[PDB]
Amino acid sequence: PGLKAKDLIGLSQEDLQRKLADLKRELLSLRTMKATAGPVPERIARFRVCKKDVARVLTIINQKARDEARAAFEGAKYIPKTFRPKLTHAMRCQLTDKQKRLLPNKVMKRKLQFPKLKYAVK
Amino acid sequence: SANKTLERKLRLGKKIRMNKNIPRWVILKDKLKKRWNYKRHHWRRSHLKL
């Protein structure tokens, strides 16, 4: 029952917006029917489907918008904080791996003239 | 009293909506042994402190 996001991803923004408007309108109609009279099985059956349909359409719209916006800031120096890589606070505030391996030049020179070798005893 | 803030009024509103029994179809759907809700209150006996 209800729509599928599969064939929903194949519409334009305006079409999805209109679809959402109609879904919300008829959701209000079903709420009125529930509030008055009595809950016949068919309208109550349609009710749950309509709620999840609204959910699905909103999902599709937001995903499309996010993809466009993310493509807008692909190569900038500063991007919105909602697109930066997912990490924790502690690992965000940390030195990278090459910064940890840096050495002063004198120690670099020393550690190159005496490299590690393989040997066996006896 | 008759001169209350909306904040106090909203917390007392939730207490009234929650003072209900266990529905009959719930008791038998879950096969319940104890059929009374012991989180109910009565105005003449309680102190809500809200």
Partner: protein, 49 residues
């Protein structure tokens, strides 16, 4: 309105009554799950390297 919370060691029962783990702990649960079995470590390694 003090910035810190009122906690005292001479009563471990009140600490027991209100503390971390007595609520939902939504964000902490999600992060712990993503770390123990997930891709948080791979992401961190790629970001640091």
């Amino acid at each position: 309105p003090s910035a810190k919370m009122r906690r005292y060691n001479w009563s471990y029962k009140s600490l027991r009554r209100r503390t971390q783990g007595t609520g939902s702990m939504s964000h902490m649960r999600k992060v712990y799950r993503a770390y123990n079995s997930g891709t948080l470590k791979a992401n961190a390694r790629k970001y640091l390297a």
